[PDB]
Amino acid sequence: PTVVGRIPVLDVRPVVQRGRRPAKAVTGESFEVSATVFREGHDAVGANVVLRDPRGRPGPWTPMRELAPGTDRWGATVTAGETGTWSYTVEAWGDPVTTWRHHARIKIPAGLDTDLVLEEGARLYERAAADVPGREDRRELLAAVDALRDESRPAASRLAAALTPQVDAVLARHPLRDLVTSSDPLPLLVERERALYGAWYEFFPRSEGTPHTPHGTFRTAARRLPAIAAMGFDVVYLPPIHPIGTTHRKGRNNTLSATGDDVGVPWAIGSPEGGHDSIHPALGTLDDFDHFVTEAGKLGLEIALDFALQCSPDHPWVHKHPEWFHHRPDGTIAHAENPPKKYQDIYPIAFDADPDGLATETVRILRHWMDHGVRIFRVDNPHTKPVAFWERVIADINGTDPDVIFLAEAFTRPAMMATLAQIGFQQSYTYFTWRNTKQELTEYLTELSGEAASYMRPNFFANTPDILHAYLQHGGRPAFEVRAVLAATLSPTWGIYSGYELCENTPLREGSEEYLDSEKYQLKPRDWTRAAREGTTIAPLVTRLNTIRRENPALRQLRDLHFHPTDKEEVIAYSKRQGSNTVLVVVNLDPRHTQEATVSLDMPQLGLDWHESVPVRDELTGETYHWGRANYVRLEPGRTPAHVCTVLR
Amino acid sequence: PTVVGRIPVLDVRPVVQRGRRPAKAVTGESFEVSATVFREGHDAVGANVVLRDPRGRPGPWTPMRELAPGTDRWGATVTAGETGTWSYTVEAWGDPVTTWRHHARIKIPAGLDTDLVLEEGARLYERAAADVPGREDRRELLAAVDALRDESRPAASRLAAALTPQVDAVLARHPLRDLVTSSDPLPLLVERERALYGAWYEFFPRSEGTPHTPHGTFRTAARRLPAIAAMGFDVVYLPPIHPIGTTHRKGRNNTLSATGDDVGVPWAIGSPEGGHDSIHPALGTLDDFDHFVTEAGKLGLEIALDFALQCSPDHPWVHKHPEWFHHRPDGTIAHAENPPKKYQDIYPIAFDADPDGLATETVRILRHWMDHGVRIFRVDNPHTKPVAFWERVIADINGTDPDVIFLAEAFTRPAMMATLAQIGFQQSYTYFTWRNTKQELTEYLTELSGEAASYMRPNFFANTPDILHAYLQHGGRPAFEVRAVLAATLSPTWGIYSGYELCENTPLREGSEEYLDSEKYQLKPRDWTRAAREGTTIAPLVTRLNTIRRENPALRQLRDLHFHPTDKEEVIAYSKRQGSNTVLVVVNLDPRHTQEATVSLDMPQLGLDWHESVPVRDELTGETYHWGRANYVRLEPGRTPAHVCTVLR
Structure with missing residues (x-):
C-alpha cells in the first residue's frame, strides 16, 4: 500500500x-x-x-x-x-465537469471539434445524473444531456444549455x-459550551463576614452571590476552602511569621482539622457548602473550586504518606518555590515514589467535590506537577464525568502552556495581563485565535490576587474600564478578581504586581453598598459587558476575529462575527489622554462592499452611528474607554 | 497509558x-x-x-x-x-546535577544549609559514579564525593572540588x-553520496556525428565522454535513446509538420522499430550502448537515462495496450499538453484502467536499463503521472536495487514538487533558473537548505533544453559565468546542458525561454575544438568549479549555508562549512556593470571572533587576501564574475 x-x-x-x-x-x-x-x-x-x-x-x-x-x-x-x-x-x-466546462467554453467558440466536445459533456452529465436521487434534478440533468446532443442546434446554444443556473445548482449539491x-x-x-464561553468572578468567602464574626462563613458569603449573578457572571471561582496550616503560616502582606489572629493563605492547605476533602471550620460544614452551591445554582452560578496539589506542613499526608514528598538527607521537606517567590508555608508533592497512590487519591478528592456539585476545577500552578499526571487524572475524571472542566493556571513558558492544554485542560490562563499595547494585543490574540484555538481555550482574567499590572496601577479607573472591555470582547471566557470593580490598584511597592494588603493574607471587607451609591465601582460597566456578551453570539466565540487599522497607535480596532451577528470594537488604550483617530474598516472582512456604509449601535451608550470605510472616533478616558458596537440588521 | x-x-x-x-x-x-x-x-x-x-x-x-x-x-x-x-x-x-550545581553556587556562598546541600551533591555524584564504566572516571567522581563530604574543610572548598574541569569531563560523557x-x-x-552530490552534463548523442553520417551514434557519441569527464562531471544525462515516432513528428524549431530529413523529438518515444526497451536504430544497437556505458564508467561517468512515460502515436503500446490511453468518443487519443504548449507528437498515458499492468511494465523497462548499467533515471515531467504511481514504482525498484537514483523533472507548484520528493524521488529539479536576484536566490536557498533538505535533494541545472532564461539571453558570457558559479557553489548537485559552455543564448524570440534552432528538433553539431582554441568556451571555469567542489567538502553538502550581508543589492555573499573546510563566495549578479561593495562577514557564523582577520584564497585566481569583519570587493563582469574563496586553516 x-x-x-x-x-x-x-x-x-x-x-x-x-x-x-x-x-x-x-x-x-x-x-x-x-x-x-x-x-x-x-x-x-x-x-x-x-x-x-x-x-x-x-x-x-x-x-x-x-x-x-x-x-x-x-x-x-x-x-x-x-x-x-x-x-x-x-x-x-x-472534478471532471469543471474541467470539461473550461475546455468547452474555449473550444466551442473557436469551433474546435465541437461535436466531440459536446458529446463528451453529455456523457459526464449522464453519469452525474445517474447518482442524483431527486427526480426533478435527474430530469434537469437529462434535459441538458439531450440539448448537448442535439446536433441540429448551434454549438454555442447546445453548450449554453449545460451552463444554466439550475444545472449549476444541481451539480453544486x-x-x-x-x-x-x-x-x-x-x-x-x-x-x-462553558469550556469555551463564560464570565468568571473570583472572591474569598472568608472576607464576607459580619461586624461580630469578621471571618466569613459559607452562609454569610452566600449573600454575595446575588450581586455576582446580577453582574452577569456564570462562574464563581473560590480560592481553597479547606483548613489552613499553622506551621510557617504567612501573616499580613506576605510577612514571614503570622501573629495571633492572622488567617493565613488558603493555598497552604491542611491541618489536623482536615485536608483537601475537608471544609475550613470557620467557613462552616459540608452542609453549609452544599447550601452555598445550591444558592449559587439558583442564580445560574457554577462553582469552580481551586485544586492546589500541595500541602501545608500540618497536612495529614505529611505523616500518612511521607513518600508523597521529597525529603532532604536530614528528613526535612524544602518548601515550594517559584523563584524569586518563596512559599515557606507550602510543601510541594513528589510524584515518583507513589504515582499510583497520588493519582488514586487525587481522583477521589475530585469525585468527592463533584458529588457535591462542583463541575469545574481551577488547577493551581499545574506546571510544577508532572504533565503525564494531569493527563492521567483528567482522562480518569472525564472518563466517567466528561462535563468536568479543568482550568490550568500555568503562567509559564509556551511549551508547557501548550502541552498542558493539549493533554486535556479545557481552559488555560494566558499572557493577557502582560499584553497592553496595540501591537502586543494584536500579536497575542492573532496567535490565540489562530492554530492554538484547536487545543487551547483562553480565560482572560483582567486581574488575579497575584497580578495587579502596572497598566492598572498607573492608569486608574479608566485603565480598569479599558481592560474590562478588552477581556470581555476579545475572549469568550473572561474574569475578574473581587476588588477590580472598585479599581483597587495600590501595589505592594513600585515595580511589584502584588496588591498592597493582599487578601491572600488577610480578611478584606469591602463596603459594597457605599461603592454602589457613590458610583465608585465599575460594576455597571461590567454588567453591561456581560449583557452585551449574552445578546451577541459573536462574543461567545474565539476563532473569528479581525483587527482593522487606525492612524493612532493608542487606538485599536477589531471585529468578531458569528452567523449574522457582527460586533465591532474600538478601544483607546491610553488611560490618560483623549485620542482621536480614523478607523479604516476592512469592509470585505465584515462582508460588505468598500463603498457601503452600514449603521452601528454603541452598546455602551445606545447611541447610533453610520460607519463605513473610514471613520472618525474620539475617545475620552473616563467618559468613553471604547466603542462596543453592533452592526445593525 | x-x-x-x-x-x-x-x-x-x-x-x-x-x-x-x-x-x-x-x-x-x-x-x-x-x-x-x-x-x-x-x-x-x-x-x-x-x-x-x-x-x-x-x-x-x-x-x-x-x-x-x-x-x-x-x-x-x-x-x-x-x-x-x-x-x-x-x-x-x-538533569539533577546541573540543578544542584546551580543552587550550590548560590547557597554555599550565602551560607544557606551548607552541610545539607553538600551531602545532597555527594549522593548525586555517588549515583553518577555507579553508572560510569571507566575505572579512572569512577575514581575521579568518588574523589569529589569524598571532598564534598569532608566536613573538616571550608564549604566553598568542598564545593569547588566537585566543579573541576576533569569532573565536568567525566559527567559530560x-x-x-x-x-x-x-x-x-x-x-x-x-x-x-551521488543522491546528494554530483556534477551533471546533458547532451544529445545524435548531435555528435560525422561529415559522412551526421546523425551521431553511441560509438561516435562516446568520443565526447573524455571531454565531459575532463570538465569534472560525474553524471551524463541522455535524452531518450529510443526510436522516435513519425506520426505528427515535429520539424525544426517546433514546427508542426516534419519534412524528409527531420529527426523529430526524442521524447516522442516509439515506432514499429521499438519502444522504451529499444535503441533508436540510428544510434546503433544495445551492444553499442553497452560500449558507451562501459567507456563512460572508465572515465568515472555514470549514465542517467531519461524515463518519459508517454508514447508517440506509433508506439506499439498504442495497439498492444489501448486501455493505457484515454480515448475520446470518436476513438482518438488527445495529444499531451503543458498549456500553452502543445505536444501533438506525444500521447499521454492513462493510469486508471490497468494500473497494475502499467506498473509491472514500467519496472520491467527500468530493470532492463539497470541490467545494462543505468543506475540513475531522469524522470520526465513526473507531475503529469499519478503521485502514488511513482511511490509504488520507486519503492519497487529500490526494494531490490536501493542504489537506483531517481531525479524528478517537476516544474510545477510547490505542493506537487515537495510531495514528489517525499514519496521517494532522490533528487528534484528546482526553481533555480527563475531565481536570479539576490532576494530571490537568498529566499529560495534559505528554503532549500532548511527544512526541505530532510526530503528534497536539489539538482541545479543552470540551463536545460527547455529553459534559456532571460538573464542569460540579456547577460551574455558574464551571465553564464555567474550562473555556473552559483549553481556549483549553492547546491551539492548541479548541471548544464551542452551549449551552455559556448554561451548559446539566442532565444526562439523575445519573451521565450526556448532556444532558437532547438536541438530537440534538429541535429546541432558544435565545433568544440575551435571554441577551445579561440577561448570562446567557459569550459575552463566549469572545470575549475568541479575541481574546487572535489577539493572542498563544504561544497559537497547542502544544509550548512549562511548568507552574509553586503551594501550592494547586485552583490551576494554566502558561506558553507563541513568540518574544518569553509568556503566563502561573493558574486556580482550584475552581468553588465562592475560592482564594488563592502562584504560584512558574520564572523561567529564562520566560527571566528569579530576582530579576527583570517586569510583566504580565491580558488578561481589563486590570489590570497586577508579578510575579516568588513571587506571591500570589486568585481568586473568579464574579468571576475565572483570570488570563490577557501578560509586557510
Whole structure:
C-alpha cells in the first residue's frame, strides 16, 4: 500500500500531536478544517469535509474551496454538535465537469471539434445524473444531456444549455466526483459550551463576614452571590476552602511569621482539622457548602473550586504518606518555590515514589467535590506537577464525568502552556495581563485565535490576587474600564478578581504586581453598598459587558476575529462575527489622554462592499452611528474607554 | 497509558508526513535532529539523540543543547553512516546535577544549609559514579564525593572540588540522567553520496556525428565522454535513446509538420522499430550502448537515462495496450499538453484502467536499463503521472536495487514538487533558473537548505533544453559565468546542458525561454575544438568549479549555508562549512556593470571572533587576501564574475 492515495489529500488540519491527541471544539462552535489537495496533470480537483459524530454518523455535504490561488490549500467551515468524541476526514476527488466546462467554453467558440466536445459533456452529465436521487434534478440533468446532443442546434446554444443556473445548482449539491480519496480520520473532542464561553468572578468567602464574626462563613458569603449573578457572571471561582496550616503560616502582606489572629493563605492547605476533602471550620460544614452551591445554582452560578496539589506542613499526608514528598538527607521537606517567590508555608508533592497512590487519591478528592456539585476545577500552578499526571487524572475524571472542566493556571513558558492544554485542560490562563499595547494585543490574540484555538481555550482574567499590572496601577479607573472591555470582547471566557470593580490598584511597592494588603493574607471587607451609591465601582460597566456578551453570539466565540487599522497607535480596532451577528470594537488604550483617530474598516472582512456604509449601535451608550470605510472616533478616558458596537440588521 | 511521558519530549524533527515517510540523508551527511524538551517544576532537563543503524545498533553519545533561550527547543547534529533504513529517537531526562550545581553556587556562598546541600551533591555524584564504566572516571567522581563530604574543610572548598574541569569531563560523557523518556522512533533513509552530490552534463548523442553520417551514434557519441569527464562531471544525462515516432513528428524549431530529413523529438518515444526497451536504430544497437556505458564508467561517468512515460502515436503500446490511453468518443487519443504548449507528437498515458499492468511494465523497462548499467533515471515531467504511481514504482525498484537514483523533472507548484520528493524521488529539479536576484536566490536557498533538505535533494541545472532564461539571453558570457558559479557553489548537485559552455543564448524570440534552432528538433553539431582554441568556451571555469567542489567538502553538502550581508543589492555573499573546510563566495549578479561593495562577514557564523582577520584564497585566481569583519570587493563582469574563496586553516 502507498502513503499517498489516488488523489493526494495531505496535511489535514487541525492536528494536535500528530493525531495522538484530539483537536477541540464545543457545541455550536464553528472551525475550519483544511488540507492540501491536488492531482496530477491539469484537470480540476474538488474536496469536502466529512464530520462524523460519536455514533459515526456523517454530517451534511461540506464542500471545500481553495483558500488562496496557487496554494493547493483547501478549507471548509464545520460546526460541532453534541458533546463527545468525533472525527473528521477530507475527501478529495477529480472534478471532471469543471474541467470539461473550461475546455468547452474555449473550444466551442473557436469551433474546435465541437461535436466531440459536446458529446463528451453529455456523457459526464449522464453519469452525474445517474447518482442524483431527486427526480426533478435527474430530469434537469437529462434535459441538458439531450440539448448537448442535439446536433441540429448551434454549438454555442447546445453548450449554453449545460451552463444554466439550475444545472449549476444541481451539480453544486451533487457533484460528479472522480477517484474519491480519503484522509485517515482525525479526532475531535467536543465539550460543553462553558469550556469555551463564560464570565468568571473570583472572591474569598472568608472576607464576607459580619461586624461580630469578621471571618466569613459559607452562609454569610452566600449573600454575595446575588450581586455576582446580577453582574452577569456564570462562574464563581473560590480560592481553597479547606483548613489552613499553622506551621510557617504567612501573616499580613506576605510577612514571614503570622501573629495571633492572622488567617493565613488558603493555598497552604491542611491541618489536623482536615485536608483537601475537608471544609475550613470557620467557613462552616459540608452542609453549609452544599447550601452555598445550591444558592449559587439558583442564580445560574457554577462553582469552580481551586485544586492546589500541595500541602501545608500540618497536612495529614505529611505523616500518612511521607513518600508523597521529597525529603532532604536530614528528613526535612524544602518548601515550594517559584523563584524569586518563596512559599515557606507550602510543601510541594513528589510524584515518583507513589504515582499510583497520588493519582488514586487525587481522583477521589475530585469525585468527592463533584458529588457535591462542583463541575469545574481551577488547577493551581499545574506546571510544577508532572504533565503525564494531569493527563492521567483528567482522562480518569472525564472518563466517567466528561462535563468536568479543568482550568490550568500555568503562567509559564509556551511549551508547557501548550502541552498542558493539549493533554486535556479545557481552559488555560494566558499572557493577557502582560499584553497592553496595540501591537502586543494584536500579536497575542492573532496567535490565540489562530492554530492554538484547536487545543487551547483562553480565560482572560483582567486581574488575579497575584497580578495587579502596572497598566492598572498607573492608569486608574479608566485603565480598569479599558481592560474590562478588552477581556470581555476579545475572549469568550473572561474574569475578574473581587476588588477590580472598585479599581483597587495600590501595589505592594513600585515595580511589584502584588496588591498592597493582599487578601491572600488577610480578611478584606469591602463596603459594597457605599461603592454602589457613590458610583465608585465599575460594576455597571461590567454588567453591561456581560449583557452585551449574552445578546451577541459573536462574543461567545474565539476563532473569528479581525483587527482593522487606525492612524493612532493608542487606538485599536477589531471585529468578531458569528452567523449574522457582527460586533465591532474600538478601544483607546491610553488611560490618560483623549485620542482621536480614523478607523479604516476592512469592509470585505465584515462582508460588505468598500463603498457601503452600514449603521452601528454603541452598546455602551445606545447611541447610533453610520460607519463605513473610514471613520472618525474620539475617545475620552473616563467618559468613553471604547466603542462596543453592533452592526445593525 | 499516556501520550506524554515522564519527561516531555515532543515534536521530534525532521519528520515527513507525520512519520509515514522517511527523512533523508546520504552517507557522511550531517543534519540536525531537534525536539521540544522540558519538565514540570524548575529543575534542569537534558537530552540526547540515539541514532540506530539498519541492524538497530546505537550510535555515539550525542548530547543536545537548547537552541534558543526560553524556547525549550533542543537540537544536536547527527551523521549518517552506511546506506539503508535507520531510525532516530530523542531521549529526555532530568538533569539533577546541573540543578544542584546551580543552587550550590548560590547557597554555599550565602551560607544557606551548607552541610545539607553538600551531602545532597555527594549522593548525586555517588549515583553518577555507579553508572560510569571507566575505572579512572569512577575514581575521579568518588574523589569529589569524598571532598564534598569532608566536613573538616571550608564549604566553598568542598564545593569547588566537585566543579573541576576533569569532573565536568567525566559527567559530560556519562551524565546522571533522571527519569529517561524516549520519543517514538522516526525513519531515516540513508542513500549513496551521488543522491546528494554530483556534477551533471546533458547532451544529445545524435548531435555528435560525422561529415559522412551526421546523425551521431553511441560509438561516435562516446568520443565526447573524455571531454565531459575532463570538465569534472560525474553524471551524463541522455535524452531518450529510443526510436522516435513519425506520426505528427515535429520539424525544426517546433514546427508542426516534419519534412524528409527531420529527426523529430526524442521524447516522442516509439515506432514499429521499438519502444522504451529499444535503441533508436540510428544510434546503433544495445551492444553499442553497452560500449558507451562501459567507456563512460572508465572515465568515472555514470549514465542517467531519461524515463518519459508517454508514447508517440506509433508506439506499439498504442495497439498492444489501448486501455493505457484515454480515448475520446470518436476513438482518438488527445495529444499531451503543458498549456500553452502543445505536444501533438506525444500521447499521454492513462493510469486508471490497468494500473497494475502499467506498473509491472514500467519496472520491467527500468530493470532492463539497470541490467545494462543505468543506475540513475531522469524522470520526465513526473507531475503529469499519478503521485502514488511513482511511490509504488520507486519503492519497487529500490526494494531490490536501493542504489537506483531517481531525479524528478517537476516544474510545477510547490505542493506537487515537495510531495514528489517525499514519496521517494532522490533528487528534484528546482526553481533555480527563475531565481536570479539576490532576494530571490537568498529566499529560495534559505528554503532549500532548511527544512526541505530532510526530503528534497536539489539538482541545479543552470540551463536545460527547455529553459534559456532571460538573464542569460540579456547577460551574455558574464551571465553564464555567474550562473555556473552559483549553481556549483549553492547546491551539492548541479548541471548544464551542452551549449551552455559556448554561451548559446539566442532565444526562439523575445519573451521565450526556448532556444532558437532547438536541438530537440534538429541535429546541432558544435565545433568544440575551435571554441577551445579561440577561448570562446567557459569550459575552463566549469572545470575549475568541479575541481574546487572535489577539493572542498563544504561544497559537497547542502544544509550548512549562511548568507552574509553586503551594501550592494547586485552583490551576494554566502558561506558553507563541513568540518574544518569553509568556503566563502561573493558574486556580482550584475552581468553588465562592475560592482564594488563592502562584504560584512558574520564572523561567529564562520566560527571566528569579530576582530579576527583570517586569510583566504580565491580558488578561481589563486590570489590570497586577508579578510575579516568588513571587506571591500570589486568585481568586473568579464574579468571576475565572483570570488570563490577557501578560509586557510
